[PDB]
Every structure is written in structure tokens, then in C-alpha cells.
Design a protein around this ligand. Structure first.
Ligand SMILES: Cc1ccc2oc(-c3c4c(N)n[nH]c(=O)c4nn3-c3ccccc3)c(C)c2c1
Length: 289
């Protein structure tokens, strides 16, 4: 691998810890990084580290590198999972990014359903706002996420939402429409029709996915189209079906979901617009229920 001193961390400054997840991407572990900031060389920072599995191919390496390189280019934002450093020399590739201690947004919402304190309506709108803000930043850097969903939003110790996995390499022509998430759900349920049917990914199709994520927020981690298999989903979308309004959701916020699901991509709102609308809605939202 080519040396890049902008990002290199000596690997004896990385104390590897417990796993966070394994799969086709390799494996991710929690870790402690000693002297990340050159200012404080005696401070440890909890971080997450991605590395390759043992039986990993030359393409597997190339995908991890392009993911690291994409993060380098995109730059930093409060509401995305930021690259912190890399271990690339004399050993296995380690890609180091911010650690979000409260896990993904789907799990976080589900743990706070009434029978870990319940979320106020302002907490929920503010969650949406922060995700929209991350996507606004990513879109401004010309980044199309392609798999925006609550499972790909991570929550920090301080309840900050961070978009994850915006830099993954995907061959969209090799998507397995039938492949489930570890949770048993079908990622096709977050795709715009023009991405699902025609493989056309845009900022406008990420806005479609954001609408689904909004629905996940206000159902507190609900599963979209529960029990609906791929073939029937295709039919629903061909017919123009749209998910029902969640209970505990204003008509204004449901109108936002429906606009994100506009049949015509050019007529959906932009993330810039959604940020402005959500900002207005946060201010007007009662944190008393
Ligand atoms: C390049 C890179 C390096 C380390 C990483 O670590 C995570 C991550 C988490 C994290 N950074 N904080 N908090 C978490 O809960 C968490 N889960 N995962 C994870 C791990 C595997 C699959 C899906 C989610 C990603 C997304 C990642 C990406």
C-alpha cells in the first residue's frame, strides 16, 4: 500500500478490543488509540477499526482502500462517521473511524419504546434533522449514499446522529434483491422505484430512502412493509402504494414523508430543503410529550 502520512497511525498506538461486527466487509473491532491528536499524546480515544478477513481477495482489499480513500476526500462533518486514521504499513490494513457508543438508530429507537427513557416528540424530530444534515453535507460533496436507512445511522454517547457507510464500494449490478439484513429485513424496501427497477441512483433516490427512514423514526424502529416479499413489493410500487401514516406523527411530518416518496424524482424535496423544514419543525415542536 502507498504511504500517506496525512493519516498514518503507528500500529502500536492501537489497542485492539472487542468485535463490533463481521461480514463481507471483513470485521470491525472496538479499539483504543493512544495519541491520536498529536497535541495530547497520552490520551486514549475509543475508535472503531475495520480490517479484512483472512480468506479475503484482492478485490476485497481494493474495496476497503477505495472506501478509506473516499472518506479522505469527503472531509469532516458532525453528522457522518469520520475517518480518523489508518494503519497501512508493515501489516494488515486498518481503517480507523469515530466510535458511536450507542449503536445504530433502529436499535436505539426500539429500546426506547414504551413497555431507558422514552423519546419526546422533539427528540424524534431532532433525530430526523441531524440525519438530514448529514445527508445535506454528503450531497454537497456529490456523494450518493445508495443505502440510507436507520440501520446505517449511528448514535454517539451524546445522542448525535452520524451517517455511516456512505463510502462503501457497491457494484449495484450485483445486488441480491432477496438478501436480508442481519435483522431479517429486505434493503429493497428503502430504494426509490427508479433505483429498484432501473438501477438509477441519484440524490433524489436518497431522498426517497430518507422518507422511509423518517417513517422508521416515527414508528420507533418499525419494520417497513412487514411480511411483504420482494415480488409483492415490486407490485406495490408499480401500483403507487405508499406506507400509512404512523401514529404519533403529525400530518406535516407525514406530508414530508409522502413528498420524499414523490413518483417523479424531480419533484421530491432536496436535503437542503428538508434541513430547512425540519429546523422549522424542531423549533415549533413540544418537548412536553
Ligand atoms: C470503515 C469503518 C471502520 C470502522 C467501522 O465501525 C462501524 C461501526 C460502528 C461504529 N463506528 N461505532 N459504533 C457502532 O456501533 C458501530 N457499528 N459499526 C458497524 C460495523 C460493521 C457493520 C456495521 C456497523 C462502521 C460502519 C465502520 C466503518
Amino acid at each position: 500500500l502507498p504511504e500517506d502520512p496525512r493519516w498514518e497511525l503507528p500500529r502500536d498506538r492501537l489497542v485492539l478490543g472487542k468485535p463490533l461486527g463481521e461480514g463481507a466487509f471483513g470485521q470491525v473491532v472496538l479499539a483504543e488509540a493512544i495519541g491520536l491528536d498529536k497535541d495530547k499524546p497520552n490520551r486514549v480515544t475509543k475508535v472503531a477499526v475495520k480490517m479484512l478477513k483472512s480468506d479475503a481477495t484482492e478485490k476485497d482489499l481494493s474495496d476497503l482502500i477505495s472506501e478509506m480513500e473516499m472518506m479522505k476526500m469527503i472531509g469532516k462533518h458532525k453528522n457522518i462517521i469520520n475517518l480518523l486514521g489508518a494503519c497501512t504499513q508493515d501489516g494488515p490494513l486498518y481503517v480507523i473511524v469515530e466510535y458511536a457508543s450507542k449503536g445504530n438508530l433502529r436499535e436505539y429507537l426500539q429500546a426506547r419504546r414504551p413497555p431507558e427513557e422514552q423519546l419526546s416528540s422533539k427528540d424524534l424530530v431532532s433525530c430526523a434533522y441531524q440525519v438530514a444534515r448529514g445527508m445535506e453535507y454528503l450531497a454537497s460533496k456529490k456523494c450518493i449514499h445508495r443505502d440510507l436507512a436507520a440501520r446505517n445511522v449511528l448514535v454517539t454517547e451524546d445522542n448525535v446522529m452520524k451517517i455511516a457507510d456512505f463510502g462503501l464500494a457497491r457494484d449495484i449490478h450485483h445486488i441480491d434483491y432477496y438478501k436480508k439484513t442481519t435483522n431479517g429485513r429486505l434493503p429493497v424496501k428503502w430504494m426509490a422505484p427508479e433505483a429498484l427497477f432501473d438501477r438509477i441512483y441519484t440524490h433524489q433516490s436518497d431522498v426517497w430512502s430518507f422518507g422511509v427512514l423518517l417513517w422508521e423514526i416515527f414508528t420507533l424502529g418499525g419494520s417497513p412493509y412487514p411480511g411483504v416479499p420482494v415480488e409483492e413489493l415490486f407490485k406495490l410500487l408499480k401500483e403507487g402504494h405508499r406506507m400509512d401514516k404512523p401514529s404519533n406523527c403529525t400530518n406535516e411530518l407525514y406530508m414530508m414523508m409522502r413528498d420524499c416518496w414523490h413518483a417523479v424524482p424531480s419533484q421530491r424535496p432536496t436535503f437542503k430543503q428538508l434541513v430547512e423544514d425540519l429546523d422549522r419543525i424542531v423549533a415549533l415542536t413540544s418537548n412536553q410529550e
